[PDB]
PDB file of all heavy atoms in Angstrom:
ATOM      1  N   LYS Q  18      13.742 -45.031  -5.973  1.00 40.30           N
ATOM      2  CA  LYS Q  18      12.966 -45.707  -4.935  1.00 40.30           C
ATOM      3  C   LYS Q  18      13.309 -47.190  -4.858  1.00 40.30           C
ATOM      4  O   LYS Q  18      13.656 -47.705  -3.789  1.00 40.30           O
ATOM      5  CB  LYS Q  18      11.471 -45.520  -5.198  1.00 40.30           C
ATOM      6  CG  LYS Q  18      11.045 -44.081  -5.440  1.00 40.30           C
ATOM      7  CD  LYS Q  18      11.124 -43.246  -4.174  1.00 40.30           C
ATOM      8  CE  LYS Q  18      10.341 -41.951  -4.324  1.00 40.30           C
ATOM      9  NZ  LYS Q  18       8.870 -42.187  -4.302  1.00 40.30           N
ATOM     10  N   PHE Q  19      13.218 -47.893  -5.981  1.00 38.31           N
ATOM     11  CA  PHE Q  19      13.546 -49.308  -6.050  1.00 38.31           C
ATOM     12  C   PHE Q  19      14.858 -49.507  -6.799  1.00 38.31           C
ATOM     13  O   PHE Q  19      15.451 -48.566  -7.333  1.00 38.31           O
ATOM     14  CB  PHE Q  19      12.420 -50.100  -6.728  1.00 38.31           C
ATOM     15  CG  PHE Q  19      11.256 -50.406  -5.823  1.00 38.31           C
ATOM     16  CD1 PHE Q  19      10.090 -50.950  -6.341  1.00 38.31           C
ATOM     17  CD2 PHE Q  19      11.327 -50.160  -4.457  1.00 38.31           C
ATOM     18  CE1 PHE Q  19       9.014 -51.240  -5.518  1.00 38.31           C
ATOM     19  CE2 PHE Q  19      10.255 -50.446  -3.628  1.00 38.31           C
ATOM     20  CZ  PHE Q  19       9.097 -50.987  -4.161  1.00 38.31           C
ATOM     21  N   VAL Q  20      15.307 -50.759  -6.828  1.00 37.21           N
ATOM     22  CA  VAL Q  20      16.516 -51.151  -7.544  1.00 37.21           C
ATOM     23  C   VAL Q  20      16.117 -51.587  -8.950  1.00 37.21           C
ATOM     24  O   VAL Q  20      15.065 -52.213  -9.148  1.00 37.21           O
ATOM     25  CB  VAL Q  20      17.279 -52.252  -6.768  1.00 37.21           C
ATOM     26  CG1 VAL Q  20      16.395 -53.469  -6.480  1.00 37.21           C
ATOM     27  CG2 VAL Q  20      18.579 -52.656  -7.469  1.00 37.21           C
ATOM     28  N   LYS Q  21      16.924 -51.204  -9.941  1.00 36.26           N
ATOM     29  CA  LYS Q  21      16.620 -51.481 -11.336  1.00 36.26           C
ATOM     30  C   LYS Q  21      17.639 -52.381 -12.021  1.00 36.26           C
ATOM     31  O   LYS Q  21      17.335 -52.899 -13.102  1.00 36.26           O
ATOM     32  CB  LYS Q  21      16.485 -50.165 -12.121  1.00 36.26           C
ATOM     33  CG  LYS Q  21      15.138 -49.471 -11.939  1.00 36.26           C
ATOM     34  CD  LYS Q  21      15.077 -48.546 -10.734  1.00 36.26           C
ATOM     35  CE  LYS Q  21      13.640 -48.233 -10.341  1.00 36.26           C
ATOM     36  NZ  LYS Q  21      13.571 -47.219  -9.252  1.00 36.26           N
ATOM     37  N   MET Q  22      18.818 -52.588 -11.405  1.00 36.65           N
ATOM     38  CA  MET Q  22      19.880 -53.563 -11.765  1.00 36.65           C
ATOM     39  C   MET Q  22      20.223 -53.611 -13.258  1.00 36.65           C
ATOM     40  O   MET Q  22      20.614 -54.655 -13.784  1.00 36.65           O
ATOM     41  CB  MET Q  22      19.576 -54.980 -11.230  1.00 36.65           C
ATOM     42  CG  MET Q  22      18.250 -55.685 -11.601  1.00 36.65           C
ATOM     43  SD  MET Q  22      18.216 -56.646 -13.130  1.00 36.65           S
ATOM     44  CE  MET Q  22      19.273 -58.022 -12.690  1.00 36.65           C
ATOM     45  N   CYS Q  23      20.147 -52.475 -13.950  1.00 35.85           N
ATOM     46  CA  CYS Q  23      20.432 -52.444 -15.385  1.00 35.85           C
ATOM     47  C   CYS Q  23      21.299 -51.229 -15.703  1.00 35.85           C
ATOM     48  O   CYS Q  23      20.795 -50.105 -15.794  1.00 35.85           O
ATOM     49  CB  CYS Q  23      19.144 -52.444 -16.200  1.00 35.85           C
ATOM     50  SG  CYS Q  23      18.324 -54.055 -16.293  1.00 35.85           S
ATOM     51  N   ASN Q  24      22.606 -51.469 -15.853  1.00 33.25           N
ATOM     52  CA  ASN Q  24      23.504 -50.476 -16.437  1.00 33.25           C
ATOM     53  C   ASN Q  24      23.068 -50.132 -17.851  1.00 33.25           C
ATOM     54  O   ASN Q  24      22.804 -48.969 -18.167  1.00 33.25           O
ATOM     55  CB  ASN Q  24      24.944 -51.026 -16.416  1.00 33.25           C
ATOM     56  CG  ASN Q  24      26.000 -50.100 -17.084  1.00 33.25           C
ATOM     57  OD1 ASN Q  24      25.958 -49.787 -18.281  1.00 33.25           O
ATOM     58  ND2 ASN Q  24      26.980 -49.693 -16.288  1.00 33.25           N
ATOM     59  N   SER Q  25      22.990 -51.134 -18.712  1.00 32.35           N
ATOM     60  CA  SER Q  25      22.904 -50.946 -20.148  1.00 32.35           C
ATOM     61  C   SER Q  25      21.528 -51.348 -20.654  1.00 32.35           C
ATOM     62  O   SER Q  25      20.629 -51.682 -19.876  1.00 32.35           O
ATOM     63  CB  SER Q  25      23.988 -51.745 -20.875  1.00 32.35           C
ATOM     64  OG  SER Q  25      23.931 -53.114 -20.519  1.00 32.35           O
ATOM     65  N   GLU Q  26      21.343 -51.153 -21.966  1.00 32.92           N
ATOM     66  CA  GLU Q  26      20.328 -51.653 -22.907  1.00 32.92           C
ATOM     67  C   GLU Q  26      18.909 -51.151 -22.639  1.00 32.92           C
ATOM     68  O   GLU Q  26      18.089 -51.139 -23.563  1.00 32.92           O
ATOM     69  CB  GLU Q  26      20.326 -53.198 -23.001  1.00 32.92           C
ATOM     70  CG  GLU Q  26      19.744 -54.023 -21.849  1.00 32.92           C
ATOM     71  CD  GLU Q  26      20.831 -54.635 -20.957  1.00 32.92           C
ATOM     72  OE1 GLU Q  26      22.038 -54.417 -21.197  1.00 32.92           O
ATOM     73  OE2 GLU Q  26      20.479 -55.351 -19.988  1.00 32.92           O
ATOM     74  N   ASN Q  27      18.619 -50.776 -21.387  1.00 35.81           N
ATOM     75  CA  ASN Q  27      17.839 -49.660 -20.852  1.00 35.81           C
ATOM     76  C   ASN Q  27      17.783 -49.930 -19.353  1.00 35.81           C
ATOM     77  O   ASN Q  27      17.919 -51.085 -18.940  1.00 35.81           O
ATOM     78  CB  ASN Q  27      16.434 -49.484 -21.455  1.00 35.81           C
ATOM     79  CG  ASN Q  27      15.658 -50.780 -21.570  1.00 35.81           C
ATOM     80  OD1 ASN Q  27      16.122 -51.844 -21.166  1.00 35.81           O
ATOM     81  ND2 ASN Q  27      14.459 -50.693 -22.139  1.00 35.81           N
ATOM     82  N   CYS Q  28      17.546 -48.914 -18.530  1.00 34.40           N
ATOM     83  CA  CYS Q  28      17.534 -49.115 -17.080  1.00 34.40           C
ATOM     84  C   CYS Q  28      16.126 -49.485 -16.609  1.00 34.40           C
ATOM     85  O   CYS Q  28      15.468 -48.730 -15.893  1.00 34.40           O
ATOM     86  CB  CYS Q  28      18.053 -47.866 -16.375  1.00 34.40           C
ATOM     87  SG  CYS Q  28      18.435 -48.095 -14.627  1.00 34.40           S
ATOM     88  N   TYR Q  29      15.686 -50.677 -17.034  1.00 36.03           N
ATOM     89  CA  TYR Q  29      14.281 -51.074 -16.943  1.00 36.03           C
ATOM     90  C   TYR Q  29      13.822 -51.196 -15.495  1.00 36.03           C
ATOM     91  O   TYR Q  29      14.502 -51.788 -14.653  1.00 36.03           O
ATOM     92  CB  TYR Q  29      14.058 -52.401 -17.676  1.00 36.03           C
ATOM     93  CG  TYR Q  29      12.600 -52.789 -17.839  1.00 36.03           C
ATOM     94  CD1 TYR Q  29      11.834 -52.269 -18.878  1.00 36.03           C
ATOM     95  CD2 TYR Q  29      11.993 -53.683 -16.961  1.00 36.03           C
ATOM     96  CE1 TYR Q  29      10.501 -52.622 -19.030  1.00 36.03           C
ATOM     97  CE2 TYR Q  29      10.661 -54.041 -17.106  1.00 36.03           C
ATOM     98  CZ  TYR Q  29       9.921 -53.506 -18.141  1.00 36.03           C
ATOM     99  OH  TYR Q  29       8.600 -53.860 -18.296  1.00 36.03           O
ATOM    100  N   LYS Q  30      12.653 -50.627 -15.216  1.00 35.86           N
ATOM    101  CA  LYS Q  30      12.192 -50.414 -13.852  1.00 35.86           C
ATOM    102  C   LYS Q  30      11.292 -51.559 -13.412  1.00 35.86           C
ATOM    103  O   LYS Q  30      10.260 -51.826 -14.038  1.00 35.86           O
ATOM    104  CB  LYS Q  30      11.482 -49.067 -13.726  1.00 35.86           C
ATOM    105  CG  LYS Q  30      12.409 -47.892 -14.010  1.00 35.86           C
ATOM    106  CD  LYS Q  30      11.859 -46.578 -13.491  1.00 35.86           C
ATOM    107  CE  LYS Q  30      12.801 -45.430 -13.804  1.00 35.86           C
ATOM    108  NZ  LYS Q  30      13.141 -45.366 -15.254  1.00 35.86           N
ATOM    109  N   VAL Q  31      11.694 -52.229 -12.337  1.00 37.53           N
ATOM    110  CA  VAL Q  31      10.966 -53.352 -11.764  1.00 37.53           C
ATOM    111  C   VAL Q  31      10.363 -52.897 -10.443  1.00 37.53           C
ATOM    112  O   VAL Q  31      11.076 -52.378  -9.576  1.00 37.53           O
ATOM    113  CB  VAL Q  31      11.889 -54.568 -11.561  1.00 37.53           C
ATOM    114  CG1 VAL Q  31      11.181 -55.663 -10.775  1.00 37.53           C
ATOM    115  CG2 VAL Q  31      12.381 -55.091 -12.902  1.00 37.53           C
ATOM    116  N   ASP Q  32       9.052 -53.078 -10.297  1.00 37.95           N
ATOM    117  CA  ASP Q  32       8.372 -52.780  -9.048  1.00 37.95           C
ATOM    118  C   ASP Q  32       7.955 -54.024  -8.278  1.00 37.95           C
ATOM    119  O   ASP Q  32       7.609 -53.911  -7.097  1.00 37.95           O
ATOM    120  CB  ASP Q  32       7.140 -51.900  -9.309  1.00 37.95           C
ATOM    121  CG  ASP Q  32       7.513 -50.478  -9.684  1.00 37.95           C
ATOM    122  OD1 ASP Q  32       8.651 -50.062  -9.381  1.00 37.95           O
ATOM    123  OD2 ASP Q  32       6.671 -49.776 -10.278  1.00 37.95           O
ATOM    124  N   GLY Q  33       7.987 -55.198  -8.906  1.00 39.26           N
ATOM    125  CA  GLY Q  33       7.653 -56.433  -8.222  1.00 39.26           C
ATOM    126  C   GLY Q  33       6.192 -56.584  -7.864  1.00 39.26           C
ATOM    127  O   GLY Q  33       5.863 -57.340  -6.945  1.00 39.26           O
ATOM    128  N   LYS Q  34       5.305 -55.886  -8.564  1.00 37.95           N
ATOM    129  CA  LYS Q  34       3.879 -55.908  -8.276  1.00 37.95           C
ATOM    130  C   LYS Q  34       3.119 -56.470  -9.469  1.00 37.95           C
ATOM    131  O   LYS Q  34       3.376 -56.093 -10.616  1.00 37.95           O
ATOM    132  CB  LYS Q  34       3.365 -54.506  -7.937  1.00 37.95           C
ATOM    133  CG  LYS Q  34       3.953 -53.919  -6.665  1.00 37.95           C
ATOM    134  CD  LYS Q  34       3.252 -52.625  -6.280  1.00 37.95           C
ATOM    135  CE  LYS Q  34       3.931 -51.962  -5.092  1.00 37.95           C
ATOM    136  NZ  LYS Q  34       3.305 -50.654  -4.752  1.00 37.95           N
ATOM    137  N   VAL Q  35       2.184 -57.376  -9.187  1.00 35.42           N
ATOM    138  CA  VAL Q  35       1.380 -58.003 -10.221  1.00 35.42           C
ATOM    139  C   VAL Q  35      -0.070 -57.520 -10.201  1.00 35.42           C
ATOM    140  O   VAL Q  35      -0.659 -57.324 -11.271  1.00 35.42           O
ATOM    141  CB  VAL Q  35       1.451 -59.542 -10.089  1.00 35.42           C
ATOM    142  CG1 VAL Q  35       0.735 -60.242 -11.242  1.00 35.42           C
ATOM    143  CG2 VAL Q  35       2.899 -60.001 -10.006  1.00 35.42           C
ATOM    144  N   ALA Q  36      -0.641 -57.268  -9.018  1.00 34.29           N
ATOM    145  CA  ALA Q  36      -2.041 -56.868  -8.908  1.00 34.29           C
ATOM    146  C   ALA Q  36      -2.302 -55.454  -9.415  1.00 34.29           C
ATOM    147  O   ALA Q  36      -3.466 -55.084  -9.603  1.00 34.29           O
ATOM    148  CB  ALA Q  36      -2.506 -56.987  -7.455  1.00 34.29           C
ATOM    149  N   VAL Q  37      -1.257 -54.659  -9.639  1.00 33.17           N
ATOM    150  CA  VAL Q  37      -1.397 -53.333 -10.232  1.00 33.17           C
ATOM    151  C   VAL Q  37      -1.618 -53.479 -11.731  1.00 33.17           C
ATOM    152  O   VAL Q  37      -1.490 -54.577 -12.286  1.00 33.17           O
ATOM    153  CB  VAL Q  37      -0.168 -52.453  -9.944  1.00 33.17           C
ATOM    154  CG1 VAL Q  37      -0.028 -52.205  -8.450  1.00 33.17           C
ATOM    155  CG2 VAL Q  37       1.083 -53.094 -10.515  1.00 33.17           C
ATOM    156  N   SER Q  38      -1.967 -52.375 -12.389  1.00 32.59           N
ATOM    157  CA  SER Q  38      -2.177 -52.377 -13.830  1.00 32.59           C
ATOM    158  C   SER Q  38      -0.873 -52.645 -14.574  1.00 32.59           C
ATOM    159  O   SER Q  38       0.224 -52.380 -14.075  1.00 32.59           O
ATOM    160  CB  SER Q  38      -2.764 -51.040 -14.282  1.00 32.59           C
ATOM    161  OG  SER Q  38      -2.584 -50.850 -15.675  1.00 32.59           O
ATOM    162  N   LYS Q  39      -1.006 -53.174 -15.789  1.00 35.99           N
ATOM    163  CA  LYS Q  39       0.129 -53.502 -16.639  1.00 35.99           C
ATOM    164  C   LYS Q  39       0.605 -52.315 -17.467  1.00 35.99           C
ATOM    165  O   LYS Q  39       1.395 -52.501 -18.399  1.00 35.99           O
ATOM    166  CB  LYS Q  39      -0.230 -54.665 -17.568  1.00 35.99           C
ATOM    167  CG  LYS Q  39      -0.496 -55.982 -16.857  1.00 35.99           C
ATOM    168  CD  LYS Q  39       0.725 -56.465 -16.094  1.00 35.99           C
ATOM    169  CE  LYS Q  39       0.485 -57.842 -15.494  1.00 35.99           C
ATOM    170  NZ  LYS Q  39       1.635 -58.301 -14.669  1.00 35.99           N
ATOM    171  N   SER Q  40       0.145 -51.104 -17.151  1.00 35.53           N
ATOM    172  CA  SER Q  40       0.466 -49.912 -17.924  1.00 35.53           C
ATOM    173  C   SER Q  40       1.336 -48.926 -17.149  1.00 35.53           C
ATOM    174  O   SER Q  40       1.386 -47.744 -17.501  1.00 35.53           O
ATOM    175  CB  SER Q  40      -0.819 -49.237 -18.401  1.00 35.53           C
ATOM    176  OG  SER Q  40      -1.753 -49.109 -17.343  1.00 35.53           O
ATOM    177  N   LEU Q  41       2.021 -49.384 -16.098  1.00 33.64           N
ATOM    178  CA  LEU Q  41       3.077 -48.590 -15.486  1.00 33.64           C
ATOM    179  C   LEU Q  41       4.467 -49.046 -15.900  1.00 33.64           C
ATOM    180  O   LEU Q  41       5.396 -48.230 -15.895  1.00 33.64           O
ATOM    181  CB  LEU Q  41       2.976 -48.619 -13.950  1.00 33.64           C
ATOM    182  CG  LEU Q  41       3.038 -49.901 -13.106  1.00 33.64           C
ATOM    183  CD1 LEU Q  41       4.460 -50.293 -12.690  1.00 33.64           C
ATOM    184  CD2 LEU Q  41       2.178 -49.723 -11.867  1.00 33.64           C
ATOM    185  N   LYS Q  42       4.628 -50.329 -16.241  1.00 34.17           N
ATOM    186  CA  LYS Q  42       5.934 -50.854 -16.624  1.00 34.17           C
ATOM    187  C   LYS Q  42       6.404 -50.280 -17.954  1.00 34.17           C
ATOM    188  O   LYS Q  42       7.612 -50.151 -18.179  1.00 34.17           O
ATOM    189  CB  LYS Q  42       5.888 -52.381 -16.707  1.00 34.17           C
ATOM    190  CG  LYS Q  42       6.092 -53.101 -15.384  1.00 34.17           C
ATOM    191  CD  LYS Q  42       4.766 -53.417 -14.711  1.00 34.17           C
ATOM    192  CE  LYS Q  42       4.979 -53.988 -13.319  1.00 34.17           C
ATOM    193  NZ  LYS Q  42       3.713 -54.026 -12.536  1.00 34.17           N
TER     194      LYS Q  42
END
Side-chain angles (χ1 to χ4, degrees):
Chain Q
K18 310 290 196 72
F19 280 171
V20 56
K21 280 87 198 186
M22 56 87 70
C23 284
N24 177 298
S25 55
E26 74 258 1
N27 46 2
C28 193
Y29 190 83
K30 297 197 181 54
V31 172
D32 288 340
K34 295 188 186 177
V35 186
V37 296
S38 161
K39 295 299 185 184
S40 48
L41 59 89
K42 276 94 187 168

